[PDB]
Amino acid sequence: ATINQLVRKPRKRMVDKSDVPALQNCPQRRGVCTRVYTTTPKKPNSALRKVCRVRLTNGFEVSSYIGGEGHNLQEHSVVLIRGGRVKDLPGVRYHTVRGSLDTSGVKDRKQGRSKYGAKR
Amino acid sequence: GYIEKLVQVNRVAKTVKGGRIFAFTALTVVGDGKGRVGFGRGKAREVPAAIQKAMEAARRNMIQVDLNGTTLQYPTKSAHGASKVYMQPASEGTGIIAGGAMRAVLEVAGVQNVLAKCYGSTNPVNVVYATFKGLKNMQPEAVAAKRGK
Amino acid sequence: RYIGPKCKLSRREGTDLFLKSGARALDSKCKAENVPGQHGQRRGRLSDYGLQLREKQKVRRIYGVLERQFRGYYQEASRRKGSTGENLLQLLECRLDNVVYRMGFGSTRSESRQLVSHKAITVNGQTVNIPSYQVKAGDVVAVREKSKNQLRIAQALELCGQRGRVEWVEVDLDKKAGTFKSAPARSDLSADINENLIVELYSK
Amino acid sequence: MVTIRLARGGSKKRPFYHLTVTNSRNARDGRFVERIGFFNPVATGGEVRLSVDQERATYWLGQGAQPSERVAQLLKDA
Amino acid sequence: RTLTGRVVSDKMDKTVTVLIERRVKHPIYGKYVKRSTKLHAHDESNQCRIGDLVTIRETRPLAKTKAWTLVDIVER
Amino acid sequence: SMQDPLADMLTRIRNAQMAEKTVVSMPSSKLKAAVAKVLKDEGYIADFQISSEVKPQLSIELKYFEGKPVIEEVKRISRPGLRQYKSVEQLPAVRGGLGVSIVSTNKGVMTDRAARAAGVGGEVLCTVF
RNA sequence: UGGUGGGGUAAAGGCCUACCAAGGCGACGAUCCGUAACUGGUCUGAGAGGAUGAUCAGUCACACUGGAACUGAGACACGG
RNA sequence: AGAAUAAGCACCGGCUAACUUCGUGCCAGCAGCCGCGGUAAUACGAAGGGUGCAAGCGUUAAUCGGAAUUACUGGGCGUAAAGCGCGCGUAGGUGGUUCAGCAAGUUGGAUGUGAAAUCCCCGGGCUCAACCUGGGAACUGCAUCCAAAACUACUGAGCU
């Protein structure tokens, strides 16, 4: 740790590994739905949430959350991916964005229309 | 001094076999606008008394900080426990550029361009200690050297 | 510029704002006795950073300025040498949006900012149309010679000694032409601001 | 190949020249041998036209550089 | 025009290599470190043994990895 | 082993400053004697006392203030390891210039005030404050 | 890796060559392995720095991929 | 000729002083950290109002920052993570003591540069701002040169 020992072997700053294995410094990355299904939350909560499995165009097998209150993503859609880790859902770190290509958009959704895919 | 500044409230608990009884400690400082700073907190049940049970000792232990006039004496190296404090004087025009509990003690002293910092622990219980040991040894002339400079 | 109805902006502050619509009063019929918002029949916890906000969010609501425009004016305060607070309101008084009314050609800043875009207020024999010109100490201030019989320019000459003189200009009322003499210090301003406390809303 | 030449700085519809001494092996706006003083044909009040210093301008004519076509009739403005 | 190093290897004719040592600072660490530089010096008459100290001069290259000749044996 | 002559004297008096002793004696060199002569001229100590015999020693007579004495700390900067050879533009004004910042130069092991008005820098030795 | 005889390049030089000798490089990181044009600079920073090379300018490098010369002042030549 | 051709976005449980209810009921959901929802919901869906700053507002992503969270400036190690189980000692790092010498590190000045751009101030101009340039400042750098000898290496005689 001394300045002699720094010239011998200097302090290497340890790199921080990124949170997303996919999205290789890309803000969005297109995918194709392998499977949409139902997932339970973590124990101190309880609900029924709907997540999707996608293969990406990087060929990767990760899960994205369909963030709508209603969707017609019918098992082969062309859904677009953002990041962000949903807390209550374990082990998954991606979200399907609304109104991208095949994501139809949440019904009425009258505030936050830029988030959940609504015109006007 | 009547230029008191509240530092922190923090909700203290302790347990009886009946259950958990809660108490509030709250530290405030008291300065005079010219450099007599004080310290203290109180142990009571309630919010509006634990800040004046802080005044119970905050007017006590007031010591005249040896100012220069609007500007601090030196670059400072100071510590208490696991908190360490850096300071240095600034020139003319910048205001309060300290942080958290450092802007409370260094604004009641008559200096305004303060530029104080916190290193090690950030606990405001032990933070206000190292700030006054930063101000306890201030002297432009009170060295025993037989020379004005 | 901020637009819309403006009786509701006279209520948050408590000061007259120099934002009005006529020539007799302000906050005298648009029922200023409460604190508006979503639900404001009760107050509570009126302290530092939200007050440092209400300082700057008053100064923003007077001077026709956006935060695109105004926090670039704190950028010149550090480009200024020393005394950053009053040197902020220097360029708000070398501002032409205010000093049309600080002379008094228009009713308020809402008529001052407007007519200079409508090719009224020249600077020095040129054609200036911006509400951001920086008037030097010692130019004339005149009006283009087609808005002279615009009679709402004559609807502003009644408040010269009624809103009080500024005692920093020397103007000719016959020509409708003025002259900005010198820049103010912090003695020529209204006492409702805190100039080195708008400064503190920069780091947090 | 060595040449004293007008070289476009400035903005679009805002010409400003440098009067670079170049090699005619490079572009107009890169790798000049020397910048002697400038030119500005949009010159209005307070802006000097051309900062032609004949202390160095003698040297490239002395060492064998040439005006292009216009550079000859900027020295004719003297 | 003066570079000085101590002789470390002489077993070839007309050619010698020396350690032109120096002690210079580390940029972000501040401690002055030594940085040894092992030049090659050309001898016209091959009179330098291991442990000698010489000075050298730069000219056109005398071989590959050799562009410095012998000036004078300063000491031994 | 001992590895630095003058850092061994600058430590041995500070624990004696917080102790109740006055005359400090140790086996001394000319290097430690040239340092001691400059801060008696700054009003800190007096009468360095070369013993002038074989194994020569330094009896520095440090002064007391009432209660806490005159020198709080002596902070070594250039120890022997990272030895802080510093220029004249970058001299340390230690405590606003109330530290005198003795710097070893060719024409004298000398304070920072005379190091700048006659410009030679070098070994920034220690905090005297 | 040197030494000389020659050979050769517009120009020094194991660059090419024959023969003589056993040297040369490297723990201050050689060689191998992965990665990347570099710099003036750029971005966050109290600064130290850290990250970084899009427009702009200098140098480098390439021209489907590889080898090769030719002509010419200048190429191993992007529309040879 | 005449206001005819122009505003939108996101939030409002906290530490952000923007902070009623209606529908929904451990459902449906939101969210960066706590968490919120299990029946009067300031945390979730509208309406009803405000507020952030505006032809943009937001959130996905990447960089540095706060981060003393790789600490040269500027951190650690009895019990939180961390003393090899300890030796002999190679390179190396550093080295008691005095005079003299050297001038490699150290110190000052000299000169060429460190291209132009960018930046930093003073300006000039676009009606103003970007932008544009003029002037310098800056470029902590590099070798050469002479001057210095307190300290370090090196050199020599020593001192205990």
Side-chain angles (χ1 to χ4, degrees), chain A:
Chain A
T2 71
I3 47 92
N4 189 9
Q5 197 169 0
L6 295 179
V7 176
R8 293 169 62 196
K9 289 177 72 69
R11 293 181 190 271
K12 297 295 182 183
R13 276 84 66 194
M14 55 88 203
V15 68
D16 193 0
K17 64 177 178 66
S18 180
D19 57 357
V20 289
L23 299 173
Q24 293 85 19
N25 68 28
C26 292
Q28 292 86 20
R29 180 71 67 186
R30 196 182 72 247
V32 173
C33 289
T34 299
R35 168 65 179 270
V36 298
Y37 63 97
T38 60
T39 312
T40 60
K42 194 65 67 177
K43 186 68 182 70
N45 300 320
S46 181
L48 184 63
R49 289 182 183 175
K50 63 275 290 181
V51 79
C52 76
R53 175 74 69 189
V54 290
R55 289 192 293 113
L56 280 74
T57 191
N58 292 319
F60 293 152
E61 185 75 20
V62 297
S63 296
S64 301
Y65 182 70
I66 299 168
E69 292 186 354
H71 64 277
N72 53 7
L73 299 176
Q74 195 262 329
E75 290 289 336
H76 289 287
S77 295
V78 66
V79 301
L80 274 73
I81 308 303
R82 68 179 174 87
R85 195 261 305 174
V86 47
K87 186 185 295 295
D88 199 358
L89 289 168
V92 300
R93 289 187 298 279
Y94 297 104
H95 291 282
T96 299
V97 300
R98 304 288 298 175
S100 63
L101 290 177
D102 201 2
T103 311
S104 180
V106 186
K107 57 185 68 64
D108 291 330
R109 183 61 65 186
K110 302 296 286 184
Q111 65 179 0
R113 293 180 298 276
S114 68
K115 280 92 174 66
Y116 295 100
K119 199 71 74 178
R120 298 182 292 114

Side-chain angles (χ1 to χ4, degrees), chain C residues 2 8 12 36-39 45 47-51 53-54 56-57 60-61 66-68 79 114 118 126-130 132-133:
Chain C
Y2 178 62
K8 293 181 180 181
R12 295 285 288 165
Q38 182 176 357
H39 291 90
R45 189 61 66 87
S47 59
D48 287 334
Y49 67 88
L51 198 152
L53 189 144
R54 287 293 94 195
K56 187 259 288 183
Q57 296 298 108
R60 189 260 193 191
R61 285 181 177 180
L66 295 175
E67 285 83 1
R68 181 76 181 175
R79 188 71 182 271
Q114 190 175 6
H118 290 288
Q126 60 186 355
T127 303
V128 177
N129 55 5
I130 188 167
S132 293
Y133 188 82

Side-chain angles (χ1 to χ4, degrees), chain C residues 134-154:
Chain C
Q134 297 304 111
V135 52
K136 57 182 278 186
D139 277 339
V140 76
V141 171
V143 180
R144 184 260 188 91
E145 295 88 1
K146 194 251 285 184
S147 293
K148 296 192 290 182
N149 291 117
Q150 286 295 112
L151 74 159
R152 68 173 185 172
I153 298 172

